[PDB]
From a paper:
CusB is a membrane fusion/adaptor protein (MFP) and CusC is an outer membrane (OM) protein belonging to the outer membrane factor (OMF family). Together, CusABC likely forms a protein complex spanning the inner membrane, periplasmic space and the outer membrane, analogous to the well-studied AcrAB-TolC multidrug efflux pump from E. coli and the MexAB-OprM multidrug efflux pump from Pseudomonas aeruginosa. Thus, the CusCFBA proteins form a tetrapartite system dedicated to the efflux of heavy metal ions from E. coli. Here we present the 2.3 Å X-ray crystal structure of CusC, the first structure of an outer membrane component of a heavy metal efflux pump.
There is one monomer of CusC (440 residues) within the asymmetric unit, with the biological trimer formed by the symmetry within the crystal. As is the case for the other OMF proteins, CusC is a cannon-shaped molecule, forming a ∼130 Å long α/β-barrel that is composed of three monomers. Each of the monomers contributes 4 β-strands to the 12-stranded β-barrel that resides within the OM, and 4 long α-helices to the periplasmic α-barrel. The CusC trimer forms a huge, continuous internal cavity with a cylindrical shape and a volume of ∼28,000 Å3 (∼90×20×20 Å), which is filled with water. By contrast, the interior of the entire barrel is strikingly electronegative. The channel is closed on this end by Van der Waals interactions between the Leu403 residues of the three monomers, analogous to the situation in OprM. In addition, an adjacent ring of negatively charged residues (Asp407) provides an additional layer of closure of the barrel on the periplasmic side. In our structure of CusC, density is clearly visible for three partial acyl chains attached to Cys1 of each CusC monomer; one single chain and another chain that is clearly branched. Thus, analogous to the E. coli Braun lipoprotein and many other bacterial lipoproteins, CusC is most likely triacylated at the N-terminal cysteine residue with N-acyl and S-diacylglycerol functions. In addition, despite the apparent specificity of CusC for small substrates, its extracellular opening is the largest observed for any OMF protein to date (∼30 Å diameter, measured as Cα-Cα distance).
Numbering used by the authors:
A (entry chain A), B (entry chain A), C (entry chain A): 1 to 20, 32 to 440
């Protein structure tokens, strides 16, 4: 029988709503097909996930090892014994023996059963941890893919900005050849060509870094995805009821893992309680003995045997009690751990919801800003070409336009990362 | 008796001065009352700290478990034994027995005593670690609070900057309606409205993130503090003698923790030394036996018993010596750990002192810069409105003014974080 | 004998080339002599490395402890036994005994041998980890040194930029005193003085922080290096064949560490296999006994003794099999760990190669940009001083010039860090 306390799910340590459903599969959440191809490959070859799978097997084997301790043992024994005096008849005595013995703990108060149940729960927790690494990998690969695509896109706008600045410069040169501009405007147009080449070189770096990170995550080194057009429709962004319950969190693998750890701790309390109670063992044996080898295996020399035993703990100076206290304190630790895991999950979902609003509003504003800058550039050119304003007006408008384009790319990347983070924080596929 | 070496505090691994006292309580260090209310709540509900408290209890129980091993044990035993031959009189022999036995290790050379002392020191170290989590939490909550307030303040100046830019734009529009300005100036004034809306949306994000981080730290989800006015007087910044001794560091909990770990290691050396010496045990028992159950508990079948024993290690192939070496090497590791903890603490205090000077000087300079920018803006407006300069003068002055205001807010936040870090690095309250 | 599987190096988990040799010693790689002096000091006093050295000693001792378990033991025993009835002749029986006994496990199937070999391999792995900390420290010290030098250089250009801005301001003042400029230009020139003072204060902070980090790494607090002139020739940057083989990675200490861990796991498989097989032990003793102490050590009371024993596992409910499974699964884990270590190393080398190209191209472009900005500044001054353009042209050119200089310093630092990272990722000296 078991002395373990019954499982009780701790009180929800977070509000019941995120601020006032089930995810689709990742094959549906991700629209872009390239990212899905990379995710599938990662699921096969990624080393971290492979390691997480092996840890599940290990824990399964440890469960088996511990469970085995509940079953009877049967073992053989062989012995020979020479001995004699040191004075007063120096004749050697000699005896041979052979034992075949079985052993069995009755485990009436469930010590061994519960140590086993604890290992089974650790195994269950380990499977959940595995599931967590699985969804975190899907998230990470996808993000890594979009980071690569961001690098491509940044490189692309940098090159077309280079082309633009080269045209601007050629034009100012032509003007100068007609004694129509000045040497200041020319040097300004030349400068921005160089800073743009610098940006190009930077984006090449980031691309290479993105590629290398992606290949580490895949655990494979085949050809990388090429640049593709990517947008808000690349993901099927989560739609959520207005009063989505916090209870969705309890479905994440990492939270289920914590739950199983809590059950393991309950089982360890049962095991520690059992120590206070009598324990009954049983050993039975077939045995033989003889002073010489010849008549050893003689039925004549044989003996059967059957010996039940009971041990009764009486006083142990608070050993059992201290050990029980450790188990109880550790169960309390598991409860806090469970609470921490949920509070952390709640923070991830709340942040991603807030960030979704913030990022959408930043992007919208940034788009309107860009449109205004394009108009500004056009007006500045016209006014400059008619000698009404200095070339600094053109330079300034170009710089801001280019910076805004790079910022807008970064924001769209942040938006996709956040959508992926949200999906994942809700438990993924 | 104990074979452990005496404790000796390692030579100070850092200079004796920080570069040429006792903290007040956090209730006094923090002036702002809101932050103190949040700190008090965190001290109650925060999960990390609760977990640190449970670890102290666990270590206390482990100390008790180990100490118990020093005391006598008294246990019961019950047995029944059926056995018989296999040929040549197949009559079964049967014997029942019941033992009540006491056990006691004399521990003359302090093996068990020292293993106990080691656990007591681990327990002491664990209390110190707890105290460390406690002061780190006070620090973190306070910082998290000021980060929230920074977000509020950034949002506030962004909105008033929005209002300003809308007035600027309305004015340029009016000018245009009088054929007095141009379409370039108008588009420039429009643009900055949009970039400011973008900043507003960003600050809303950061606010939401700040709120969520603060609630994670509190472990509670009641209403959040509203924006309040915050300044250098929100903290009672530490005043330090010119030649403050490094010795103040030895009062931090994390350093005391290291000290207790060092004592534990000393105790483990004592325990390992004891293994080389004889060990004396003592077992005494009341016992009975009979071939049938009826005359079992007969005083007739009973026997008392008393058996002192001594074990003497002679040769063990370097087992004891290797084990002693591990203990000695581990004590050396504890010494290095202690040194590392102090050197790290010294770095924290030195950095915060340097940062205090740097930040004060940056803020002072930035204030003078801001004042200059306000004047510049005013002059640019006047000159622009009289057709003496382009609107780019106004735009440029506005942009720099706004950026400087945001920078100044960030610097004041950094200053408070650094003051808090300094307080904490000196051991907190 | 050993039941362990033979070592087989896992298939290379990365491409055979980095994208289409041996490092020199760090004394040769680093040209700058100051950095080498700091590296030498760190190698002596650094706490992390000292700790890594102690861990090697600890593992060596654990190897010795485990190996000792393979050798015979010889121990002494002394006993006295008083016992008597409880009724029916209350005369006490009394017996004294003294045993000297030897013990020896034959270890025919190599259980103990392999547990020893596992510990020897853990020791070997620990030496490699030590070597890793050693090369990582050389890297970190060098980087920390160049970061200090970066701080010095940033402070220096900030001060000369301050001097420049003060001259610019004095000039505008003079112009105003001749009713030749305006109050806008003056306030603009004043502003940039203040922002530059802010930068100066920031660089003082960073310098102080750099110094404190460097002293933590050195584990010593003597005088710090002063500013020196530093450039691309401070390091003898690695030259690599076009088709450098990935195989160079297998020379890194961290990868060799993984290899030894793999061998340890192989040994543990051997140990677990041995459990299925019979085990033969041997105990031999000299012994005495007597009812009184006087005739105790009488050769008369003495007995010699010799007892070989064999244990044969028959059925254990899958205990041995589960334990074997754990060992096999753990060996598979070591293989994955080995693969991870290599893939990670491959990423470090690939990133550093890409970054070397990117950084060189950014620096080249940034130099050309700087040269263009110097010309722009000169042209703007001339045009401004002749009333042809506003002072905003001068301000703008100064700001960009100063920002580009700071950026160029940061890029040169990044280049040196990357060269150091490359050297280190290839196995260092």
């Amino acid at each position: 029988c078991s002395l373990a306390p019954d499982y009780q799910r701790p009180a929800m340590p977070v509000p019941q709503q995120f601020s006032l459903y089930q995810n689709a599969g990742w094959r549906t959440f991700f629209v872009d097909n390239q990212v899905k191809t990379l995710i599938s490959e990662a699921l096969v070859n990624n080393r971290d996930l492979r390691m997480a799978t092996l840890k599940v097997q290990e824990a399964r084997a440890q469960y088996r090892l511990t469970d085995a301790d509940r079953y009877p043992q049967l073992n053989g024994e062989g012995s020979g014994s020479w001995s004699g005096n040191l004075k007063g008849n120096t004749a050697t005595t000699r005896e041979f023996s052979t034992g075949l013995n079985a052993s069995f703990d009755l485990d009436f108060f469930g010590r061994l059963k519960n140590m086993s149940e604890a290992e089974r729960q650790n195994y269950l927790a380990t499977e959940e941890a595995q599931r967590a690494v699985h969804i975190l990998l899907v998230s990470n690969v996808a993000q890594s893919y979009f980071n690569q695509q961001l690098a491509y896109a940044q490189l692309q706008i940098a090159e077309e900005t280079l082309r633009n600045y080269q045209q601007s410069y050629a034009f100012v040169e032509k003007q100068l050849l007609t004694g129509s501009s000045n040497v200041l405007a020319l040097e300004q147009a030349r400068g921005v060509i160089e800073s743009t080449r610098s940006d190009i070189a930077k984006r090449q770096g980031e691309l290479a870094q993105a590629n290398n990170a992606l290949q580490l995550l895949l655990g494979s080194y085949g050809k990388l995805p090429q640049a593709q057009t990517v947008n808000s429709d690349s993901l099927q962004s989560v739609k959520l009821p207005a009063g989505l319950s916090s209870q969705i969190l309890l479905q994440r693998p990492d939270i289920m893992e914590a739950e199983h750890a809590l059950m393991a701790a309950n089982a360890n309390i049962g095991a520690a309680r059992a120590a206070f109670f009598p324990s009954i063992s049983l050993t039975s044996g077939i045995s033989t003995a003889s002073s010489d080898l010849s008549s050893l295996f003689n039925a004549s020399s044989g003996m059967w045997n059957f010996i039940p035993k009971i041990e009764i703990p009486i006083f142990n100076a608070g050993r059992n009690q201290a050990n029980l206290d450790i188990a109880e304190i550790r169960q309390q630790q598991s409860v806090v751990n469970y609470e921490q895991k949920i509070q952390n999950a709640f923070k991830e979902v709340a942040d991603a919801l807030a960030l979704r609003q913030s990022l959408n509003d930043q992007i919208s504003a940034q788009q309107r800003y860009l449109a205004s800058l394009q108009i500004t550039l056009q007006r500045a050119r016209a006014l400059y070409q008619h000698g009404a304003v200095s070339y600094l007006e053109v330079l300034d408008a170009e710089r801001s336009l280019f910076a805004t384009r790079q910022t807008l790319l970064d924001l769209n990347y942040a938006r996709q990362v956040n959508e992926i983070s949200l999906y994942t924080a809700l438990g993924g596929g």
